[model samples]
Target chain A: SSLLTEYGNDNICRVLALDGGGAKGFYTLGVLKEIEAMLGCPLYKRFDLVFGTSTGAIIAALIALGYEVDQIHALYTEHVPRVMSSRSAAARTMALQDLAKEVFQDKTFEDVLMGIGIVATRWMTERPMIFKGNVSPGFGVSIADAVQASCSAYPFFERKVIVTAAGDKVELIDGGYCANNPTLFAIADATVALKKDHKDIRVINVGVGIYPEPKPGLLMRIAKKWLAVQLLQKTLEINTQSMDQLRDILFKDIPTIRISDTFERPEMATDLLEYNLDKLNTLRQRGRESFGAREAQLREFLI
Target chain B: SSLLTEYGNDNICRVLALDGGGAKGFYTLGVLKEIEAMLGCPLYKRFDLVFGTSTGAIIAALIALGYEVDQIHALYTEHVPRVMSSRSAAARTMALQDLAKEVFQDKTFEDVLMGIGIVATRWMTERPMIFKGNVSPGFGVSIADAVQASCSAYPFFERKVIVTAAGDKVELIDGGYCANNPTLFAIADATVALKKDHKDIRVINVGVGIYPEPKPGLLMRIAKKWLAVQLLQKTLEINTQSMDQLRDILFKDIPTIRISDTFERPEMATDLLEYNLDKLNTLRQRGRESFGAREAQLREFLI
Candidate 1:
């Protein structure tokens, strides 16, 4: 609530969205935990709504489901590899189905504030989908369906088929397929959904990997365009768009907190293909330490 | 059969698995199409079974469902952008569901050559599940459910709630969470499922992206024990494990055609965030050109 006044509008609506990056999400979560610790309260308790995609979505779901920081940290440490072993696709599918039920079935999306707006994609239309609002109503899909569709990244993961109660079938995949930097969209959607009068919205974007200016090229110098720019187009485009939206939002008096460099070391995981417990632990420790180091400056901004 | 005999085993079962990397998957497809063109037959006509994860899974499913390369490429060019606009996640989900039905509604998994085995994760158990086999008699899931579960990545897409005829609910997400390099498991599973007697199994692994060497540093160098080993752990681990299994199968005469370096350029689309039609066109062109450039060397091995 104190953070809301920083924007010059006490009635400011806060919408949080975390970007997707497998293990790098831990860095985001670690930093978030540090923020909560500094504030002497939990994030879910403070934020008006939460948005997430890929690993960010997983953390958001757990938070909405009322899981603690320690619990989530333990979940990653113990379950990431255990659940995702080198096994037959059929066996793995069955195990994943079971895991989804265990992690999400206990609480309906309605139980949480604004039902934790989640970013997903409809593979057929190739559009980003947000799963929010009342969960108890006989919506076309279920909590599990929402969670599955949001994180369904193409190529690495298969797109899912969701059959609604009314017998409508849908195909969904990972939100990152379309909106890797989904905070912009999530915030806009949440603002409308909440119908808040506040013109300001505070966003927390957790970015992954670093996109340094590509090595200068000779031909590119002649062309007056960096060829390396095209090389990193996908990453550059999304980030640039996200920043543009943030700037536009800021112009409207909304403040944002982007924690990109918290765990920008080479050792940090940039993909979901593998894991090292020690590295994950190191990331978490680094996140906490970095936050602690910047506490005074951050406190001035937030307070 | 000609390609199978090149491995010195007439009864050898050929299995194909493509890795997942959003837009890079198209590069994998373009190269694969070149291979198919060189073989003078469709992959489905040659290989007994196929396995894919993420976008790879989508291609595998379509191939199993009788989609041609031209059809898939056209689908990407036409439908991918249409379906995946930077919009609300729910709208995207609905669009994708319609697309799924449009592409796969008429066919069941049982109708195809094993309906493309897909690797998924049991989020809670951290166990990999393979979705394959009988689709009709109700081994507790359907082809749609299997596809859905296999592609479910947490937070990016919502995990699906699949209800069996008996009212059993199972949750499933993307397979990449557990088996990003799912080809390793897919081959072994298909071998067992096919019950092939030949000691040789020929595989076509379609890989994307290059693994770069880690930077040298003191802690990293000391941890080189950790860094060197950990660096190797991600890519090398999966490949090495896969090779071990293949060697066990081949004993002396295993021939693997790995199309790894086809799309190693920096311009590759590593994730599904954005799509550049021109870049995609360039990638397809590059794939065809690369294949043409290496046709003689590749033909010597295949024929």
Candidate 2:
């Protein structure tokens, strides 16, 4: 949703949150689906989650590779953010080691979550948060702490209304940490953990880490990035002189909603336009109503 | 060839030099061929010559992508060198600027070359020496100076025996500079350039710098370090792992030499190999005799 008070739609943008490619052994699918259904909306309404590392960075390259700019964003941390291409094999091995250490070991989730809360409390500066997740620790406090910190550390969602595909199982261990602590949440992937424990978590399950391939290597990795670039080019190829033509070309392709799975013959994709458009409009209306209401409430207390 | 004068064939080990990938405007096949013919020798021989930047980096990657340790040497640079994948893009822009700058700004190629030279010379101490190209003034000179520094600066080479691809041409430019300013004369692309200009630069031309595409993004722009990791895995998969056992596997099916266009068929791949082995052997013998001849020659003179 656009922030109507200031920068509004113009400032709202999305980035592709790319994870390491070929990553597995973390979270599986059945658990992924439950979380998605819980969120109630597809992530495309807000952002895209890219997978792969080293090779995953290739997907981040897709933003420039060519994609729509309306809400696209790119993440490069899976590997080192930016590095030279001429380093020896020995050196590259070292770089990857460093990246792992920085992202996982150096910081804990508690710090990350509190940091985000402080940022939100300061930035939003309005009627307390519309909502927030719980922070009390218990059965699986460590994992929740990790998840909070992970979410907090990445400011990619700053000041913007975001829809994510996170796997919602954090609540199962103790209380629904995400529901208690977050201001906004959405469906992402299935959450078998959530189903079993009934945790109030939101997850987007688009397979965890790298996509499963019988064989994963430079070819598949490179090809995948190429696909992203092609997709990005469709959306971002805008600012170029070929804007209109590119727009026409992009709209020509069917959205994922339209694509049929193996079992289906062919069917039109679901119309996600209304859902997204309504989300945007509702945000706008709420903003205007809240503005004056905020001033009046504060004045009564000022005396 | 192992420099074990005291030992016989028992100590000899085969060594092969690999070149960087891209050589469109930088190196000529003629030089590669000359290098090959000369290196092909009896039993005690060595072959070395590989461009490091631009397409050369790609070629080096290609060899690493296809062969084993014995087939090629790894001369990975810490950053993008001037002549390979980075070359076309960099050169075209800088070339245009240089062309105009030279014509309008009264800049000397020497001056520009010198600017680049200072860095190249410094870089020589830091990086591998195989891949080099004549950079624009600032660009080319750095390569030239770097090449010079690479040769004389390293005391290890006396026993190391620097083997560059351009045998005859390597000598001309390398020797020309050496003969004039010993400090400035190291190996130059002159050997390859000479072959291009002079038919006598004959050696079997081994094709260089063929990239495997269908890529998602600018694979060339990838940091050299990561690229090496990806390339190394690919090369190993090919030389050690069978393609059938690993089809669609990344790193594994890094694209075989004959399997994909990523590697151009070496016009004189095998022929050049047969030839260079011989030449390298002769060079080794000459080097051995030179040690003795130098002592005798120095007896009549003083350093």
Evaluated at residue B49, the lDDT of candidate 2 is 24
| Separate DockQ for every predicted complex | 0.01, 0.01
- CAPRI tier for the interface of model 2: incorrect
Considering only chain A, what is the TM-score of each predicted structure? 0.75, 0.23
Q: Tens digit of lDDT per residue, candidate 2, span A21-89?
A: 111111111121222222232323333222111222222222222222222211222332222121233
Tell me the spans in candidate 1 whose CA falls farther than 4 Å from its real position.
A1-10, A81-95, A134-140, A197-199, A208-252, A262-264, A268-270, A293-303, B1-303
Candidate 1: which docking quality band?
A: incorrect
> Cα lDDT for residue A208, model 1?
50
Please give the range of 10 consecutive residues that has the lowest summed lDDT in model 1 chain A.
Answer: A227-236
Please give the RMSD to the true structure for each candidate, in Å. 23.4, 25.1
Give the top-scoring candidate (lDDT).
1
Tens-digit lDDT string for candidate 1 (A47-103): 666777766676777777656666776765555443344234454445445655766
Model 2 spans > 4 angstroms off: A1-11, A24-43, A48-303, B1-303
- Candidate 1 CA-lDDT value: 0.54
